[PDB]
Design a protein around this ligand. Structure first.
Ligand SMILES: N#Cc1ccc(N2CCC[C@@H](C(=O)Nc3nccs3)C2)nc1
Length: 167
Protein backbone atom coordinates (compact mmCIF):
# COMPACT_ATOMS: atom_id res chain seq x y z
CA UNK A 1 0.00 0.00 0.00
CA UNK A 2 1.26 3.47 -0.96
CA UNK A 3 0.03 7.07 -0.75
CA UNK A 4 -0.89 7.66 -4.41
CA UNK A 5 -4.57 8.59 -4.74
CA UNK A 6 -7.08 8.87 -7.56
CA UNK A 7 -5.15 6.91 -10.20
CA UNK A 8 -6.73 4.77 -12.90
CA UNK A 9 -5.08 1.35 -13.09
CA UNK A 10 -3.95 0.53 -16.63
CA UNK A 11 -2.03 -2.71 -15.98
CA UNK A 12 -0.59 -4.74 -13.13
CA UNK A 13 2.09 -2.07 -12.57
CA UNK A 14 1.12 1.13 -14.48
CA UNK A 15 -1.28 3.77 -13.13
CA UNK A 16 -2.34 7.12 -14.62
CA UNK A 17 -3.92 10.38 -13.46
CA UNK A 18 -4.73 13.85 -14.80
CA UNK A 19 -2.44 15.83 -12.52
CA UNK A 20 0.27 18.47 -12.35
CA UNK A 21 3.38 16.45 -11.46
CA UNK A 22 4.69 19.36 -9.36
CA UNK A 23 1.56 19.45 -7.19
CA UNK A 24 1.45 15.66 -7.05
CA UNK A 25 5.08 15.48 -5.89
CA UNK A 26 4.55 18.13 -3.21
CA UNK A 27 1.57 16.17 -1.85
CA UNK A 28 2.93 12.62 -1.99
CA UNK A 29 6.66 13.28 -1.41
CA UNK A 30 7.44 10.10 -3.36
CA UNK A 31 10.72 8.27 -3.05
CA UNK A 32 11.40 9.02 -6.74
CA UNK A 33 10.05 11.71 -9.05
CA UNK A 34 11.12 11.44 -12.69
CA UNK A 35 12.24 14.55 -14.56
CA UNK A 36 11.91 14.91 -18.33
CA UNK A 37 15.56 15.93 -18.63
CA UNK A 38 17.87 16.82 -21.50
CA UNK A 39 21.50 15.70 -21.72
CA UNK A 40 22.75 19.04 -20.32
CA UNK A 41 20.32 19.02 -17.37
CA UNK A 42 19.22 22.50 -18.47
CA UNK A 43 15.76 22.65 -16.92
CA UNK A 44 14.25 25.43 -18.97
CA UNK A 45 10.71 24.41 -19.83
CA UNK A 46 8.15 21.67 -19.93
CA UNK A 47 8.15 19.33 -16.96
CA UNK A 48 11.80 20.10 -16.17
CA UNK A 49 11.26 23.85 -16.06
CA UNK A 50 8.27 23.38 -13.78
CA UNK A 51 10.02 20.97 -11.39
CA UNK A 52 13.08 23.19 -11.19
CA UNK A 53 10.99 26.32 -10.54
CA UNK A 54 9.27 24.48 -7.68
CA UNK A 55 12.72 23.86 -6.09
CA UNK A 56 13.53 27.59 -6.26
CA UNK A 57 16.31 26.74 -8.80
CA UNK A 58 18.10 24.38 -6.38
CA UNK A 59 17.64 21.55 -8.90
CA UNK A 60 19.46 23.62 -11.54
CA UNK A 61 22.32 24.51 -9.17
CA UNK A 62 22.82 20.85 -8.27
CA UNK A 63 22.55 19.84 -11.93
CA UNK A 64 25.17 22.35 -13.07
CA UNK A 65 27.64 20.88 -10.58
CA UNK A 66 26.77 17.35 -11.78
CA UNK A 67 27.48 18.29 -15.42
CA UNK A 68 30.68 20.14 -14.55
CA UNK A 69 31.95 16.94 -12.91
CA UNK A 70 30.54 14.23 -15.17
CA UNK A 71 29.70 15.77 -18.54
CA UNK A 72 26.40 15.34 -20.36
CA UNK A 73 24.09 12.38 -20.09
CA UNK A 74 23.32 10.11 -23.04
CA UNK A 75 19.98 10.25 -24.82
CA UNK A 76 18.20 7.28 -23.26
CA UNK A 77 20.23 7.62 -20.06
CA UNK A 78 19.61 8.94 -16.57
CA UNK A 79 21.13 10.05 -13.30
CA UNK A 80 19.83 10.11 -9.72
CA UNK A 81 20.03 13.46 -7.95
CA UNK A 82 18.26 15.03 -5.00
CA UNK A 83 14.50 15.39 -5.01
CA UNK A 84 14.83 18.65 -3.03
CA UNK A 85 11.42 19.64 -1.57
CA UNK A 86 9.52 17.43 -4.04
CA UNK A 87 10.72 13.86 -3.40
CA UNK A 88 13.56 11.94 -1.80
CA UNK A 89 15.28 11.53 -5.18
CA UNK A 90 14.85 12.87 -8.69
CA UNK A 91 15.58 10.45 -11.52
CA UNK A 92 16.55 12.68 -14.45
CA UNK A 93 15.73 10.64 -17.58
CA UNK A 94 16.56 11.78 -21.13
CA UNK A 95 14.00 10.67 -23.67
CA UNK A 96 14.67 11.42 -27.34
CA UNK A 97 13.60 14.90 -28.43
CA UNK A 98 11.87 14.57 -31.81
CA UNK A 99 12.26 18.32 -32.34
CA UNK A 100 16.04 17.62 -32.36
CA UNK A 101 15.86 14.65 -34.74
CA UNK A 102 16.72 12.02 -32.12
CA UNK A 103 15.96 8.33 -32.63
CA UNK A 104 12.53 7.46 -31.24
CA UNK A 105 13.76 3.89 -30.66
CA UNK A 106 15.73 5.37 -27.76
CA UNK A 107 12.43 5.84 -25.92
CA UNK A 108 12.48 2.21 -24.77
CA UNK A 109 16.03 2.63 -23.43
CA UNK A 110 14.88 5.75 -21.56
CA UNK A 111 12.01 3.88 -19.88
CA UNK A 112 14.35 1.01 -18.89
CA UNK A 113 15.87 3.39 -16.32
CA UNK A 114 12.59 3.22 -14.38
CA UNK A 115 13.18 -0.49 -13.66
CA UNK A 116 15.97 0.42 -11.21
CA UNK A 117 13.35 1.88 -8.83
CA UNK A 118 10.50 0.00 -7.18
CA UNK A 119 8.01 2.91 -7.30
CA UNK A 120 8.09 6.18 -9.27
CA UNK A 121 6.00 9.25 -10.01
CA UNK A 122 6.67 10.15 -13.63
CA UNK A 123 5.60 12.04 -16.75
CA UNK A 124 5.29 10.40 -20.14
CA UNK A 125 8.80 10.45 -21.59
CA UNK A 126 9.37 12.37 -24.82
CA UNK A 127 5.84 13.87 -24.65
CA UNK A 128 5.05 17.57 -24.55
CA UNK A 129 7.84 19.78 -25.89
CA UNK A 130 9.97 16.69 -26.69
CA UNK A 131 7.62 16.17 -29.64
CA UNK A 132 6.76 12.46 -29.52
CA UNK A 133 3.25 11.00 -29.72
CA UNK A 134 2.09 10.57 -26.09
CA UNK A 135 -0.03 7.55 -27.07
CA UNK A 136 3.14 5.86 -28.29
CA UNK A 137 5.02 6.91 -25.16
CA UNK A 138 2.35 5.30 -22.97
CA UNK A 139 2.56 2.09 -25.02
CA UNK A 140 6.34 1.93 -24.63
CA UNK A 141 6.00 2.64 -20.91
CA UNK A 142 3.54 -0.22 -20.36
CA UNK A 143 5.64 -2.61 -22.46
CA UNK A 144 8.98 -1.67 -20.83
CA UNK A 145 8.51 -0.66 -17.19
CA UNK A 146 8.01 -3.56 -14.78
CA UNK A 147 8.20 -1.58 -11.52
CA UNK A 148 5.27 0.45 -10.18
CA UNK A 149 4.85 3.69 -12.12
CA UNK A 150 2.35 6.46 -11.38
CA UNK A 151 1.99 8.64 -14.48
CA UNK A 152 0.91 12.27 -14.12
CA UNK A 153 -0.58 13.82 -17.27
CA UNK A 154 -0.99 17.59 -17.05
CA UNK A 155 -3.44 18.10 -19.91
CA UNK A 156 -6.96 16.87 -19.15
CA UNK A 157 -7.85 16.54 -22.83
CA UNK A 158 -4.75 14.41 -23.43
CA UNK A 159 -5.44 12.30 -20.34
CA UNK A 160 -8.92 11.40 -21.59
CA UNK A 161 -7.53 10.51 -25.02
CA UNK A 162 -4.82 8.33 -23.46
CA UNK A 163 -7.35 6.41 -21.38
CA UNK A 164 -9.98 6.04 -24.11
CA UNK A 165 -7.46 4.75 -26.66
CA UNK A 166 -5.54 2.42 -24.34
CA UNK A 167 -5.37 -1.18 -25.48
N1 LIG B 1 5.69 19.97 -22.55
C1 LIG B 1 5.40 20.28 -21.47
C2 LIG B 1 5.03 20.66 -20.12
C3 LIG B 1 5.18 22.00 -19.70
C4 LIG B 1 4.82 22.34 -18.38
C5 LIG B 1 4.30 21.37 -17.50
N2 LIG B 1 3.91 21.68 -16.18
C6 LIG B 1 3.56 20.63 -15.22
C7 LIG B 1 2.23 20.95 -14.54
C8 LIG B 1 2.25 22.36 -13.93
C9 LIG B 1 2.56 23.41 -15.01
C10 LIG B 1 2.61 24.82 -14.42
O1 LIG B 1 3.45 25.11 -13.57
N3 LIG B 1 1.68 25.67 -14.90
C11 LIG B 1 1.44 27.03 -14.59
N4 LIG B 1 0.57 27.79 -15.26
C12 LIG B 1 0.51 29.09 -14.79
C13 LIG B 1 1.35 29.31 -13.74
S1 LIG B 1 2.27 27.89 -13.31
C14 LIG B 1 3.89 23.08 -15.71
N5 LIG B 1 4.17 20.10 -17.97
C15 LIG B 1 4.51 19.72 -19.22
Amino acid sequence: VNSFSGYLKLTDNVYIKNADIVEEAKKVKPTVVVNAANVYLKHGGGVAGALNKATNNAMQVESDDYIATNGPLKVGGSCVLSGHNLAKHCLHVVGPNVNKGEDIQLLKSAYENFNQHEVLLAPLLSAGIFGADPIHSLRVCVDTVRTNVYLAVFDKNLYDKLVSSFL
